[PDB]
Amino acid sequence: MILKRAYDVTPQKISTDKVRGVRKRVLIGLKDAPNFVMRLFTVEPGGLIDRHSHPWEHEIFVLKGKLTVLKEQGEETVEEGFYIFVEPNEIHGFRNDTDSEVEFLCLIPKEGGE
Amino acid sequence: MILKRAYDVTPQKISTDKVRGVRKRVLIGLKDAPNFVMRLFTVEPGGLIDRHSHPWEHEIFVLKGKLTVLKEQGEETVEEGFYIFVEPNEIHGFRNDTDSEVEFLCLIPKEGGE
Numbered sequence A, B: 001m002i003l004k005r006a007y008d009v010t011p012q013k014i015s016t017d018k019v020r021g022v023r024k025r026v027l028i029g030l031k032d033a034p035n036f037v038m039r040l041f042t043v044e045p046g047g048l049i050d051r052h053s054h055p056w057e058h059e060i061f062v063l064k065g066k067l068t069v070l071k072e073q074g075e076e077t078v079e080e081g082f083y084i085f086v087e088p089n090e091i092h093g094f095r096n097d098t099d100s101e102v103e104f105l106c107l108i109p110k111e112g113g114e
């Protein structure tokens, strides 16, 4: 049994073509878990995970702040206490339109990576 | 994409010998999920999920309050922002030793039910 403070995990700041202003923490990863993985994402004010898709699902829980969710033909801003399920191959992305950091847990099957 | 307020999902109170002072909400259940499910548990002050084991893992994230984790040979109390991975067949239980409600997300592979 691993019991850990999520904040104590070293984050990877993520800077790509599609991602900026985002830190990722892998809480429970591929070496720990037989089936799925748990990450914690922090998005800085104005941070972006642009639209993309992949052949595996996301189960997400919004932990802090107002999270803007990008969809194929629209967006929806939700907040802390919402859960989100993205089906395999469904176009999605995220953005922080607020002036404070937003946090969300994101879980994916091990096929998806980590 | 499902986007919903967790608190809007119908809670199942449980009042039995081994599991009491608990409310369970299935956020992403077996009709929605190809691989694993997402539940939210609220534990009232003094509530209890007694020690047990089963042949599937738990991945857990503590959302609010101070949660006491019962282990084979001990106990460890963690706070919101902590995560817990319980290995398959590992003895585990939970208790709320505080005077306020505790909330945690709990996910298991679909093999484990709901």
Ligand SMILES: [Mn+2]
Binding pocket: A052, A053, A054, A058, A092
């Ligand atoms: Mn994605």
Ligand SMILES: [Mn+2]
Binding pocket: B052, B053, B054, B058, B092
């Ligand atoms: Mn259990």
